[PDB]
Design a protein around this ligand. Sequence first.
Ligand SMILES: NC(=O)C1=CN([C@@H]2O[C@H](COP(=O)(O)OP(=O)(O)OC[C@H]3O[C@@H](n4cnc5c(N)ncnc54)[C@H](O)[C@@H]3O)[C@@H](O)[C@H]2O)C=CC1
Ligand SMILES: NC(=O)C1=CN([C@@H]2O[C@H](COP(=O)(O)OP(=O)(O)OC[C@H]3O[C@@H](n4cnc5c(N)ncnc54)[C@H](O)[C@@H]3O)[C@@H](O)[C@H]2O)C=CC1
Lengths: 310, 310
Amino acid sequence: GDVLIVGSGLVGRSWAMLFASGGFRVKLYDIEPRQITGALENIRKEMKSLQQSGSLKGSLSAEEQLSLISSCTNLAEAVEGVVHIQECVPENLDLKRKIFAQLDSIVDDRVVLSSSSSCLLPSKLFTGLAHVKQCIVAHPVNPPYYIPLVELVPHPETSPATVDRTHALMRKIGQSPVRVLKEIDGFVLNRLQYAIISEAWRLVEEGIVSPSDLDLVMSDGLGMRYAFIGPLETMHLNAEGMLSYCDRYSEGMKRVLKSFGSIPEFSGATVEKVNQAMCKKVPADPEHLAARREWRDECLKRLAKLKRQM
Amino acid sequence: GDVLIVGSGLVGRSWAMLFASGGFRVKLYDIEPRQITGALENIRKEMKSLQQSGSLKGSLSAEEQLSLISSCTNLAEAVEGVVHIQECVPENLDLKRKIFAQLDSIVDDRVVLSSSSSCLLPSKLFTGLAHVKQCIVAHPVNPPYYIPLVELVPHPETSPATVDRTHALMRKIGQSPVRVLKEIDGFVLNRLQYAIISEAWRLVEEGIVSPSDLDLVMSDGLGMRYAFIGPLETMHLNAEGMLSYCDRYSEGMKRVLKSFGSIPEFSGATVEKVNQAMCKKVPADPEHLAARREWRDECLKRLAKLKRQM
Ligand SMILES: NC(=O)C1=CN([C@@H]2O[C@H](COP(=O)(O)OP(=O)(O)OC[C@H]3O[C@@H](n4cnc5c(N)ncnc54)[C@H](O)[C@@H]3O)[C@@H](O)[C@H]2O)C=CC1
Ligand SMILES: NC(=O)C1=CN([C@@H]2O[C@H](COP(=O)(O)OP(=O)(O)OC[C@H]3O[C@@H](n4cnc5c(N)ncnc54)[C@H](O)[C@@H]3O)[C@@H](O)[C@H]2O)C=CC1
């Protein structure tokens, strides 16, 4: 019933706090001692901050949650009595493959071997492993403590049990898992994100709207609805049901989509134009970027609270 | 300094409440007496509801705001002393053209003639009008009282003054206007929306994810960020600035985008599959659709409050 975090970096620390809120004993393992010390320190500080703002997940006190998080130096011992291992090392294929191969030689047939990978495919990560049926990608969204989505991406040989157990576990710790039925480049979130970016880029390039105004169309417009309801249910409600929406607007959708330009090169004049507008709003230096991210995260924290209430 | 609403229907009522919150005297005009009576009644009720939940815009009491809203039977008299006329009749080109032609013969050179049209282009709406320099499309987003975005779409002959004045007026009543520099099919919001829908549709069709799970990827994931920050600034912050983001992810974006399938037909098997999933979540009947929209709107109302606070 214990959980093991391999790599106590940024995402590993978030996972640690999520699992602890669910009452799970969490073990932290890292190749760098300073990352473990830093993780325990930051987790304690973040936990207290959340407590003070009444933003802690679950019903366990910050104190009890912190007591559930410890570190292990020996991997072989670290996997003892663990039912879920969440890998959180850098986004590097060679490295992740090595990690899973090392785990593959010491785990039993019960434990789920889960990767936090942002884009690497399960087929490239787990093929050839003895315990491949227990492998899966459980991709969170930064910042995981505020954004609940977790993309569960299976390997073609991943067992239904592994997917079901992980879906249930993610739900248990307060996250919102989704079943990506078949692996695909960019999974689901990034494919949707890139779809938006592609059209937005061309709109700016063609002089339809300034970069700043395009962002407003989303943040003070379309994005507000998307924080509560997806694009499909949105159609469903903006007419008398999905059938009605297609009957009324499918012609227009096809017409607009047919007018879409080519795939952007993401460089040259347009990157300069977009970057200039972005830097005007938020200077591209460590201080201003961090400050804006902090604001963004606070917004997400409050939105998370609002969503739970609704 | 007065405002005239032509067509006191759903959007006309929203506009009336927006302008009144800004302290503007609002005149309602409609070809159907029952729509005026219904508008005054619903506005009064909505105003009181907002007041009770502490959701009224501006610093004027619900009582004072309501006193600023009245009706006129004669259009010629209705345009007297008005600086902005917001047309809110049905989305029908022949009809809107007739409305603007009727206004064109009685207004001065100061008043702005603004259409709420959801998709009709300024070139089709205002060409040939004597007062074309004063024409513009000011497209709000339902529900306008909670979603601030207003797309300002000009006619090629629309004067800068007309655009500037309307931008300032929209900002004065608490809305978030954007300057769509050149008219285009679907303006900006719908082009972005359709971009998302197109990819989402193919993902469901190809069995990558269920309709319900796809919606969750947005509502409990990507959509949360988009409620505060647009797609471009999002890139800017998810790396060390826009340049950094493109350097790190442009290759992947192009690769994913290149894999995108063709434009959907929005019918057949997939429409049946999507509709079935949507109806399972929200039955396609008047009662359940209205209930879900009510929930959605309440979420947006609270999000609007949250955004203003942040
Ligand atoms: N930062 C976030 O919020 C998110 C991260 N991701 C993914 O999660 C993974 C980790 O990301 P981050 O935390 O941002 O990076 P990071 O660099 O902060 O953390 C990686 C951790 O891995 C440790 N590590 C390196 N080699 C190791 C080894 N052989 N054995 C054990 N530990 C080792 C490092 O010491 C470090 O603490 C990546 O694949 C990333 O794409 C997914 C979603 C969001
Ligand atoms: N409902 C909303 O929230 C939004 C509406 N839109 C656009 O706003 C426009 C109006 O939409 P709705 O309020 O939903 O429809 P609606 O049908 O409720 O309102 C139209 C009003 O026009 C009046 N009308 C019809 N012919 C007239 C004439 N010759 N002179 C004066 N009044 C006349 C009708 O009596 C009715 O009260 C459309 O072009 C729509 O696409 C834009 C954004 C959102």
